[PDB]
Amino acid sequence: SMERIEGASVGRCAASPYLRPLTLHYRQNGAQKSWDFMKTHDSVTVLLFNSSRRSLVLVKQFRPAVYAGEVERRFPGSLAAVDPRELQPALPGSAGVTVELCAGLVDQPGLSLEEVACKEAWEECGYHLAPSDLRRVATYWSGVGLTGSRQTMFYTEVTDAQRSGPGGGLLIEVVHLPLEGAQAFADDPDIPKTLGVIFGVSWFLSQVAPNL
Amino acid sequence: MERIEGASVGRCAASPYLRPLTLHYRQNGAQKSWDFMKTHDSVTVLLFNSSRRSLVLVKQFRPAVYAGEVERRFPGSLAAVDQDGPRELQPALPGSAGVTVELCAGLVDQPGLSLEEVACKEAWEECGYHLAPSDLRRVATYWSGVGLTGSRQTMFYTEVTDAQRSGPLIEVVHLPLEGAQAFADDPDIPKTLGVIFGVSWFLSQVAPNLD
Ligand SMILES: CN1CCC(n2nc(-c3ccc(Oc4ccccc4)cc3)c3c(N)ncnc32)CC1
Ligand SMILES: CN1CCC(n2nc(-c3ccc(Oc4ccccc4)cc3)c3c(N)ncnc32)CC1
Ligand SMILES: [Mg+2]
């Protein structure tokens, strides 16, 4: 359903609420330089372990920027000199479907990072969390080359008693990855995923799974 | 490397590194659009100098990290720039606010080169270590951006000795194995997820088989 993508076309983007390209001009040890980047929000990510199912909770969705990069890789020149053309040839929508950690932007003032992660775990994963349930795994710079944003990773264990039914949050597929093949899943090069997934899986297996 | 002066922020229109695009597509039969930046793929490489029992990392000023740190502390610093040229950030932050610790890394922007060759070029240019492409082992491939970019990053690993190190801006960091995990766990040390993962991966997957 969410992997069904047709009529894909690419065009130049002028104004956008989501793209804030900027250039920093600066003198570094006397020499004048410039650097191109984008203003973006900080973010949080949360890894959930469902102990009732012995499974890590991830999310699957279509990422248009991933899709377009995959189309370019397979058909070079697809995204060339665009500055509204139909992608011919194109790829199935599954080429842009990623596996990710539950994640969201820090763009609501008055909310702690924990509260942001709880809202995203509800809205994306259908899991009811309390902010005090969350343990900070790591904080780091994401996208140091083009974005200056901090990202904070949380972890929490959940049970099926915290899982919402089908429907509920008024398109994302919730993924439950069994611990059996979790490492093999992260190591699988044919599955488009993020470093947060790869790190989250190996961190959980080496830091949490032994103590269960 | 850390002496950063006259910092000012202006609009970015062209840029070889960020190209604004919109994907138009029908998903649930419904017409949608998505704005993103076309960017380069990248490679990173984690080096383990077995002569020194140290991981090799790089320290450098990252202007985007700096600007984000100046937006924090001086909110509105990165507001929309008008037509009177760049807006001076006076006062700003010391350059150290933008200094990161990272894996050796670089852009995939030279046609004809394999990913391994890009990694070797960077390990020489940034770390002063001579590598052959056959020395590199693929650790992980992943999407480093998914939301506003769709860039792929490939992480390599190799063991080196001092025999591959050249003799006597970027700082080469040699992180002893003894304190590596505590270094990676330290939130006061501005580092990337690549460093956190690379340290954790090395200590769990490579280190136990040494000695
Ligand atoms: C000599 N040398 C050449 C490249 C010049 N250069 N590099 C970048 C840039 C862009 C993206 C990028 O992404 C990565 C790559 C690897 C790992 C993580 C992120 C890194 C650097 C750039 C920029 N954004 N704006 C202006 N000039 C920029 C600087 C001067
Ligand atoms: C209903 N809903 C509203 C937002 C709409 N929307 N979201 C994005 C967008 C931008 C950045 C972004 O960053 C993240 C966030 C979390 C984790 C990783 C990366 C995520 C989404 C967007 C876009 N770039 N262009 C056009 N429309 C876009 C879609 C439809
Ligand atoms: Mg460099």
Numbering used by the authors:
A (entry chain A): 0 to 82, 86 to 172, 178 to 219
B (entry chain B): 1 to 168, 178 to 220
Reproduce passages from the article:
Extensive crystallization trials yielded the first inhibitor-bound structure of NUDT14 in complex with 9 at a 1.82 Å resolution. Similar to NUDT5, compound 9 occupies the active site of NUDT14 where the heterocyclic core is involved in π–π stacking interactions with W34 of chain A and Y17 of chain B. In addition, the aminopyrimidine moiety is stabilized by hydrogen bonds with D35 and the aromatic ring of the phenoxy substituent interacts with L107 via hydrophobic interaction. Compared to DMSO control, 9 led to a strong increase in NUDT14 thermal stability (ΔTm = 5.5 ± 0.3).
Their name derives from a common substrate structure, nucleoside diphosphate linked to another moiety X.1 The characteristic NUDIX box is shared between family members and contains a sequence motif “GX5EX5 [UA] XREX2EEXGU”, where U is usually valine, leucine, or isoleucine and X is any amino acid. In particular, the nature of their physiological substrates remains an object for debate, e.g., NUDT5 not only predominantly hydrolyzes ADP-ribose (ADPr) to AMP and ribose-5′-phosphate but also exhibits activity against 8-oxo-dGDP, 8-oxo-GDP, 8-oxo-dADP, 2-oxo-dADP, and 5-CHO-dUDP. Here, by screening a small kinase inhibitor library, we identify ibrutinib as a dual inhibitor of NUDT5 and NUDT14 catalytic activities.
